[PDB]
Design a protein around this ligand. Structure first.
Ligand code: ILE
Ligand code: ILE
Ligand code: CO
Ligand code: CO
Lengths: 91, 91
């Protein structure tokens, strides 16, 4: 469909979410949904980003990958409707 | 307990999440959990931020309030365990 889920594994450090989102912001690229959770007994966190499927997305995944504190960035290996399901409980 | 939920209503525009998180980042203030959802049939979105209960938080709520595209910022008027509940389904 229209959107894509990007799943990031990042270091749970101050400022990594600003850097990740700044890459999108610097291009006026909107982010539709965000879920961020720490990983249990770990120094990392998971970031799920709901974004529109885009030609520019492949280049931006590359920028995200080179970021500081980002260890892995995945496209479309998560739950495609995960934000619809969360939305049933939070509005 | 240790943490606090900040609930923001913001314009669903590119770059607002970068600005919101940059205020925390500029102070090395960590953000523990994030949920961001668009509001149905609307031009806004909701941002829930899980942060440590802090003396500096009252000043930073003030900075967040003066931000561009932020219409409302609330402290502790949401679900205190909301990220624990999401965590049962997403890790
Ligand atoms: C958290 C997403 C916010 C509302 C906006 N869409 C942005 O790209 O910054
Ligand atoms: C999304 C939160 C990330 C992992 C980090 N805690 C930060 O403050 O930017
Ligand atoms: Co670091
Ligand atoms: Co705007």
């Amino acid at each position: 469909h229209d959107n894509v889920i990007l799943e990031l594994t990042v270091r749970n450090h101050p400022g990594v979410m600003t850097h990740v989102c700044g890459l999108f912001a610097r291009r006026a690229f909107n982010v539709e949904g965000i879920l961020c959770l720490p990983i249990q007994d770990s120094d990392k966190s998971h970031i799920w980003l709901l974004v529109n499927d885009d030609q520019r997305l492949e280049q931006m995944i590359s920028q995200i990958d080179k970021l500081e504190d980002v260890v892995k960035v995945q496209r479309n290996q998560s739950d495609p409707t995960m934000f619809n399901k969360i939305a049933v409980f939070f509005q």
